Coordinates of C-alpha atoms and ligand atoms in Angstrom, one line a residue:
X1 CA -19.2 -27.3 -111.0
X2 CA -23.4 -27.3 -111.9
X3 CA -24.7 -25.6 -114.6
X4 CA -28.4 -24.7 -115.3
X5 CA -30.0 -22.3 -117.7
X6 CA -32.8 -19.8 -116.9
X7 CA -35.5 -20.5 -119.1
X8 CA -37.1 -17.2 -120.5
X9 CA -40.7 -17.2 -119.3
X10 CA -41.1 -13.4 -120.3
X11 CA -40.3 -11.8 -123.7
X12 CA -37.0 -11.4 -125.3
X13 CA -35.6 -13.3 -122.5
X14 CA -33.1 -10.9 -120.5
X15 CA -32.4 -8.4 -123.5
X16 CA -33.8 -5.1 -123.5
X17 CA -33.1 -4.4 -127.2
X18 CA -34.3 -3.8 -130.3
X19 CA -31.6 -5.4 -131.9
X20 CA -31.7 -8.4 -129.7
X21 CA -33.6 -11.3 -131.1
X22 CA -37.5 -11.0 -130.7
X23 CA -39.5 -13.9 -129.4
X24 CA -42.8 -14.5 -127.4
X25 CA -42.3 -17.0 -124.0
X26 CA -43.8 -20.0 -125.3
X27 CA -44.1 -23.6 -124.3
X28 CA -42.7 -25.1 -127.1
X29 CA -39.9 -22.7 -127.1
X30 CA -39.0 -23.4 -123.5
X31 CA -39.7 -27.3 -124.5
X32 CA -37.1 -26.8 -127.1
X33 CA -34.7 -24.8 -124.7
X34 CA -34.7 -27.6 -121.7
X35 CA -34.5 -30.4 -124.3
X36 CA -31.5 -28.9 -125.6
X37 CA -30.0 -28.2 -122.0
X38 CA -30.5 -31.8 -121.2
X39 CA -28.9 -33.1 -124.3
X40 CA -25.7 -31.0 -123.2
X41 CA -26.0 -32.5 -120.0
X42 CA -27.0 -29.2 -118.0
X43 CA -27.9 -30.0 -114.6
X44 CA -30.8 -27.9 -113.8
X45 CA -33.4 -25.2 -115.3
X46 CA -35.1 -22.4 -113.6
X47 CA -38.0 -20.7 -114.2
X48 CA -38.5 -16.9 -112.4
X49 CA -42.2 -15.4 -112.1
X50 CA -42.7 -12.1 -113.2
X51 CA -46.4 -10.6 -112.6
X52 CA -45.9 -7.2 -114.7
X53 CA -43.8 -5.8 -117.3
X54 CA -41.8 -2.7 -118.1
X55 CA -43.5 -1.9 -121.4
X56 CA -41.7 0.4 -124.0
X57 CA -40.6 -0.6 -127.7
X58 CA -40.1 -4.1 -127.0
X59 CA -42.9 -4.4 -124.4
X60 CA -40.3 -6.5 -122.2
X61 CA -41.8 -8.7 -119.9
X62 CA -45.3 -7.6 -120.5
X63 CA -46.1 -11.6 -121.5
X64 CA -45.1 -13.8 -118.9
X65 CA -46.1 -17.7 -118.3
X66 CA -46.8 -19.1 -114.8
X67 CA -43.6 -20.7 -113.3
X68 CA -45.3 -24.2 -112.1
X69 CA -47.7 -25.1 -115.0
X70 CA -44.5 -24.3 -117.4
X71 CA -42.5 -26.5 -114.8
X72 CA -45.2 -28.9 -114.8
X73 CA -45.2 -29.1 -118.6
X74 CA -41.0 -29.2 -119.0
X75 CA -41.0 -32.2 -116.6
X76 CA -43.6 -33.9 -118.8
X77 CA -41.2 -34.1 -121.5
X78 CA -37.7 -34.2 -120.1
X79 CA -36.1 -37.2 -118.3
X80 CA -32.6 -36.4 -116.5
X81 CA -32.6 -32.6 -116.1
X82 CA -33.8 -30.7 -112.5
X83 CA -36.8 -28.4 -112.7
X84 CA -37.2 -25.5 -110.6
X85 CA -40.4 -23.3 -110.3
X86 CA -40.8 -20.2 -108.6
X87 CA -43.5 -19.6 -106.2
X88 CA -44.5 -16.0 -105.1
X89 CA -45.4 -16.8 -101.6
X90 CA -47.4 -13.8 -101.5
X91 CA -49.9 -15.3 -104.3
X92 CA -50.3 -19.3 -103.5
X93 CA -51.2 -20.7 -99.9
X94 CA -48.2 -22.9 -98.7
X95 CA -50.5 -26.0 -98.7
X96 CA -51.3 -25.2 -102.2
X97 CA -47.4 -25.0 -103.2
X98 CA -46.9 -28.2 -101.4
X99 CA -49.2 -30.0 -103.2
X100 CA -48.2 -28.7 -106.6
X101 CA -44.6 -29.6 -105.7
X102 CA -45.7 -33.1 -104.6
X103 CA -47.5 -33.1 -108.3
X104 CA -44.6 -32.2 -110.4
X105 CA -42.4 -34.3 -107.9
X106 CA -44.7 -37.5 -109.2
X107 CA -44.5 -35.7 -113.1
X108 CA -40.7 -35.8 -113.0
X109 CA -39.8 -38.7 -110.8
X110 CA -37.8 -37.0 -108.1
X111 CA -36.3 -33.9 -110.4
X112 CA -38.5 -30.8 -108.9
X113 CA -37.4 -28.4 -106.6
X114 CA -38.6 -24.9 -105.6
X115 CA -37.4 -21.3 -105.8
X116 CA -38.5 -19.6 -102.8
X117 CA -39.3 -15.9 -103.4
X118 CA -40.5 -12.8 -101.4
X119 CA -41.7 -10.4 -104.2
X120 CA -39.6 -7.0 -104.1
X121 CA -41.5 -4.7 -106.8
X122 CA -44.8 -3.5 -105.2
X123 CA -46.5 -2.9 -108.5
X124 CA -46.6 -6.8 -109.2
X125 CA -49.0 -7.4 -106.1
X126 CA -50.3 -3.8 -105.6
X127 CA -52.1 -4.5 -109.2
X128 CA -54.0 -7.3 -107.5
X129 CA -54.5 -5.6 -104.7
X130 CA -52.3 -8.2 -102.2
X131 CA -49.5 -6.6 -101.3
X132 CA -49.5 -6.3 -97.5
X133 CA -48.1 -2.7 -97.1
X134 CA -44.3 -1.4 -96.7
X135 CA -44.1 -3.5 -93.2
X136 CA -43.2 -6.0 -95.6
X137 CA -40.1 -4.8 -96.7
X138 CA -38.7 -5.6 -93.6
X139 CA -40.5 -8.7 -92.5
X140 CA -40.7 -10.4 -95.7
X141 CA -38.2 -13.1 -94.2
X142 CA -40.3 -13.6 -90.9
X143 CA -43.4 -14.1 -93.5
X144 CA -41.2 -16.5 -95.5
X145 CA -39.8 -18.2 -92.3
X146 CA -43.3 -19.2 -91.5
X147 CA -44.2 -20.1 -95.0
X148 CA -41.0 -22.8 -95.4
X149 CA -42.1 -24.0 -92.1
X150 CA -45.4 -25.2 -93.0
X151 CA -43.9 -26.7 -96.6
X152 CA -41.6 -28.5 -94.3
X153 CA -44.5 -29.8 -92.1
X154 CA -45.9 -31.1 -95.3
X155 CA -43.7 -32.6 -97.1
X156 CA -41.7 -34.1 -94.3
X157 CA -44.6 -35.6 -92.4
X158 CA -47.8 -35.1 -94.5
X159 CA -49.9 -32.6 -92.0
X160 CA -49.3 -29.6 -90.0
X161 CA -50.5 -28.0 -87.1
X162 CA -48.5 -25.0 -87.8
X163 CA -49.7 -21.8 -86.0
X164 CA -48.1 -18.4 -86.0
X165 CA -48.7 -14.8 -87.0
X166 CA -49.3 -15.4 -90.6
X167 CA -50.4 -19.0 -90.9
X168 CA -52.7 -21.5 -89.2
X169 CA -52.8 -24.7 -89.5
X170 CA -55.6 -27.3 -88.5
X171 CA -54.2 -30.8 -89.3
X172 CA -53.6 -29.6 -92.9
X173 CA -53.2 -32.4 -95.1
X174 CA -51.2 -33.2 -98.2
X175 CA -50.1 -36.3 -99.5
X176 CA -48.9 -38.1 -101.6
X177 CA -45.4 -36.6 -99.9
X178 CA -42.3 -36.0 -102.3
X179 CA -40.8 -39.3 -103.4
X180 CA -37.1 -37.7 -102.8
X181 CA -36.2 -34.7 -99.9
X182 CA -38.0 -31.9 -101.6
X183 CA -35.0 -29.2 -102.7
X184 CA -36.0 -25.8 -101.9
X185 CA -33.8 -22.6 -103.3
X186 CA -33.6 -18.9 -102.8
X187 CA -32.2 -15.9 -104.0
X188 CA -31.6 -13.4 -100.9
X189 CA -28.7 -11.3 -101.0
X190 CA -29.2 -9.4 -97.7
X191 CA -28.2 -10.4 -94.6
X192 CA -31.6 -11.7 -93.8
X193 CA -32.2 -13.3 -97.1
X194 CA -28.6 -15.4 -96.5
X195 CA -29.5 -16.3 -93.1
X196 CA -32.8 -17.3 -94.6
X197 CA -30.9 -19.9 -97.2
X198 CA -28.5 -20.8 -94.6
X199 CA -31.3 -22.2 -92.3
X200 CA -33.6 -23.9 -95.0
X201 CA -32.8 -23.6 -98.8
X202 CA -30.3 -26.1 -100.6
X203 CA -28.3 -23.3 -102.4
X204 CA -28.6 -19.3 -102.6
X205 CA -28.8 -17.9 -106.1
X206 CA -26.7 -14.5 -106.5
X207 CA -25.8 -12.2 -109.3
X208 CA -22.7 -12.2 -111.4
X209 CA -21.1 -9.0 -111.4
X210 CA -19.3 -6.8 -114.3
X211 CA -18.6 -7.4 -118.0
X212 CA -15.8 -10.2 -118.1
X213 CA -14.9 -9.5 -114.5
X214 CA -16.0 -13.4 -113.4
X215 CA -14.7 -13.6 -109.9
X216 CA -16.2 -10.1 -108.7
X217 CA -18.9 -11.5 -107.1
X218 CA -16.9 -13.4 -104.7
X219 CA -17.4 -11.4 -101.9
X220 CA -21.1 -11.8 -101.7
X221 CA -20.7 -15.9 -102.1
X222 CA -17.8 -15.2 -98.7
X223 CA -20.8 -13.7 -97.5
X224 CA -22.7 -16.5 -97.9
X225 CA -20.4 -18.8 -97.0
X226 CA -20.2 -17.1 -93.5
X227 CA -24.1 -17.2 -93.1
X228 CA -23.9 -21.1 -93.8
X229 CA -21.4 -21.7 -91.4
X230 CA -24.1 -20.4 -88.9
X231 CA -26.4 -23.3 -89.3
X232 CA -23.7 -26.0 -90.3
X233 CA -25.1 -26.4 -93.5
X234 CA -23.9 -27.2 -96.9
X235 CA -25.4 -24.1 -98.8
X236 CA -23.6 -23.5 -102.0
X237 CA -23.5 -20.2 -104.2
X238 CA -25.1 -20.5 -107.9
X239 CA -24.2 -17.5 -109.8
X240 CA -26.4 -15.8 -112.6
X241 CA -24.6 -14.7 -115.8
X242 CA -25.5 -14.0 -119.3
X243 CA -23.3 -15.8 -122.0
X244 CA -22.4 -13.8 -125.2
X245 CA -19.9 -16.0 -127.1
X246 CA -18.8 -16.5 -130.7
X247 CA -15.8 -17.8 -132.8
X248 CA -13.7 -15.0 -132.1
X249 CA -13.3 -12.3 -129.2
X250 CA -14.2 -9.7 -131.5
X251 CA -16.8 -11.2 -133.3
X252 CA -18.7 -11.3 -129.5
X253 CA -17.8 -8.3 -128.5
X254 CA -19.7 -6.9 -131.9
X255 CA -22.7 -8.8 -130.9
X256 CA -22.6 -7.2 -127.6
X257 CA -22.2 -3.5 -128.8
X258 CA -24.9 -4.0 -131.1
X259 CA -27.4 -5.2 -128.4
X260 CA -26.4 -2.2 -125.9
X261 CA -26.9 0.0 -129.5
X262 CA -30.4 -0.8 -129.5
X263 CA -31.8 -0.3 -126.2
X264 CA -35.2 0.2 -125.3
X265 CA -35.0 3.0 -123.0
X266 CA -38.5 3.6 -122.8
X267 CA -38.7 0.2 -121.1
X268 CA -35.4 1.2 -119.1
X269 CA -37.0 4.0 -116.9
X270 CA -40.0 1.8 -115.8
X271 CA -37.2 -0.5 -114.0
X272 CA -36.0 2.8 -112.4
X293 CA -18.6 -1.4 -117.5
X294 CA -22.3 -3.4 -117.2
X295 CA -25.1 -2.4 -119.5
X296 CA -28.9 -2.2 -118.0
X297 CA -29.6 -4.0 -121.5
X298 CA -29.6 -6.8 -119.1
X299 CA -30.6 -5.5 -116.1
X300 CA -26.8 -4.5 -115.2
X301 CA -26.3 -8.5 -115.2
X302 CA -22.6 -9.9 -115.0
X303 CA -22.0 -10.8 -118.5
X304 CA -19.3 -12.9 -120.2
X305 CA -18.7 -12.0 -123.5
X306 CA -16.0 -13.4 -125.5
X307 CA -14.8 -16.5 -127.8
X308 CA -15.9 -20.0 -126.8
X309 CA -12.7 -20.7 -125.4
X310 CA -12.6 -17.0 -123.7
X311 CA -15.9 -17.7 -122.3
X312 CA -14.8 -21.3 -121.3
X313 CA -11.8 -19.6 -119.2
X314 CA -13.7 -17.4 -117.7
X315 CA -16.3 -20.2 -116.4
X316 CA -13.6 -21.8 -114.9
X317 CA -12.4 -19.0 -113.3
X318 CA -15.9 -18.7 -111.6
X319 CA -15.7 -22.4 -110.6
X320 CA -12.6 -21.7 -108.7
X321 CA -14.4 -18.7 -106.6
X322 CA -15.2 -20.3 -102.7
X323 CA -18.8 -21.0 -102.4
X324 CA -19.4 -21.4 -105.9
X325 CA -21.4 -24.6 -106.7
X326 CA -22.7 -23.7 -109.6
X327 CA -23.8 -21.1 -112.3
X328 CA -27.0 -20.3 -113.9
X329 CA -27.2 -19.0 -117.9
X330 CA -28.9 -17.1 -119.9
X331 CA -27.9 -16.2 -123.3
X332 CA -28.6 -13.4 -126.2
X333 CA -30.3 -16.7 -128.1
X334 CA -31.2 -19.4 -126.2
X335 CA -31.0 -22.1 -128.9
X336 CA -28.1 -21.7 -130.7
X337 CA -26.6 -20.1 -127.3
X338 CA -27.4 -24.2 -125.7
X339 CA -25.8 -25.4 -128.7
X340 CA -22.8 -23.5 -129.4
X341 CA -22.4 -24.1 -125.2
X342 CA -22.9 -27.9 -125.7
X343 CA -20.6 -28.4 -128.7
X344 CA -17.8 -25.3 -127.8
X345 CA -17.7 -24.1 -124.5
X346 CA -18.5 -26.7 -122.2
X347 CA -15.5 -29.4 -123.4
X348 CA -12.8 -26.3 -123.1
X349 CA -14.0 -26.3 -119.5
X350 CA -11.9 -27.9 -116.6
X351 CA -14.5 -27.9 -114.2
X352 CA -16.8 -29.7 -116.5
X353 CA -14.9 -32.4 -117.4
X354 CA -16.9 -35.4 -116.0
Ligands
FMN401 C1 -31.3 -16.3 -110.1 C2 -32.3 -15.4 -109.4 C3 -33.8 -15.7 -109.6 C4 -34.6 -14.5 -109.3 N1 -35.8 -14.9 -109.1 C5 -36.5 -13.8 -108.8 C6 -38.1 -14.5 -109.4 O1 -38.6 -15.5 -109.8 N2 -38.9 -13.5 -109.0 C7 -38.7 -12.6 -108.0 O2 -39.6 -11.7 -107.5 N3 -37.6 -12.2 -107.4 C8 -36.5 -12.8 -108.3 N4 -35.1 -12.6 -107.9 C9 -34.9 -11.7 -107.2 C10 -34.5 -12.1 -105.5 O3 -35.6 -12.9 -104.9 C11 -34.2 -11.0 -104.5 O4 -35.3 -10.3 -104.2 C12 -32.9 -10.0 -104.3 O5 -31.8 -11.0 -105.3 C13 -33.0 -9.3 -102.9 O6 -32.4 -10.1 -102.1 P1 -33.4 -9.7 -100.7 O7 -34.5 -10.5 -101.0 O8 -32.4 -10.5 -99.5 O9 -33.3 -8.5 -100.8 C14 -34.3 -13.3 -108.3 C15 -32.6 -13.5 -108.3 C16 -31.5 -14.3 -108.8 C17 -30.3 -14.1 -108.5
LD8_402 C1 -32.3 -10.9 -113.9 O1 -34.0 -11.7 -113.2 C2 -34.5 -10.9 -112.4 C3 -33.5 -9.7 -111.5 C4 -34.2 -9.4 -110.8 N1 -35.7 -9.7 -110.2 C5 -36.2 -10.5 -110.9 O2 -37.5 -10.9 -110.5 C6 -38.3 -10.0 -110.0 N2 -35.6 -11.4 -111.9

């Protein structure tokens, strides 16, 4: 099973709590995170993009770096881990993304990939008046499809003449071309989404579900595996969890309750037994060995190729995972 880290590109990571570690997303923090991750043989790092926050006492995700520049910087200070940036396709022309990815390919030596995102919240895009109306809700995938087609032309051959409803290319050039085949990623959960993933993505990101119910996401992995049958393409699931670990189950449970107790509820309304303190993320709470066991249970779901991990505390989380969780995991004995 592959393991990656979901790097905090917004403040306070994935906890909306006054009891959660409070920190700003800085390059040097992310640098320290990816370098630790690389040290413990994590396979990849991924940064979302978030163009607007949810306010509140903690000002959750009001401070957010830009993904392609953050990963170009992380690329220049790592050597082995895989680096994925997220392009919000409404805000960047495909030809630019294409060139940006060639560029981070050059920095990283073939370690870069791109995570293509529709955009879901209207506020992110209306705020800068580029949201294309409510037609987009059920037509993003038609848009995304033309988009990916321009990228493939440019990475593939270095030119594109694509003519569709949304883009017009007239001998568009982009060289150099990526030194390796350019990995693309998607995180659609809908039928459209999976359909897209199966055609063009190299793996699909889905959400873990429940506290301490590791294999609860299995349906969606099964659905993603079904959608992949329809294109004959090997397109695995990579599931997002928050790990809250400790030396014992009681200890870890105590951290978890502590976080949920300090919920920033003003910030939680703007968004609107799992807790919304991590946006109802799938969470594994327990001792190092409890958590190792549950991840072993994740590696055994059909479709599951890897997990994408957040922590309550990234620097110690990545360390405890490296030192105490990983080496008890069957699925990581290589
Ligand atoms: C690991 C992961 C990362 C994601 N990153 C982003 C992101 O960076 N930006 C974003 O707008 N949405 C992001 N999403 C949300 C999805 O792109 C998507 O909108 C959602 O899961 C619903 O699926 P659909 O688009 O097929 O309806 C992410 C989802 C997952 C599982
Ligand atoms: C948990 O991370 C998530 C979840 C949902 N949507 C986004 O980005 C918009 N990020």
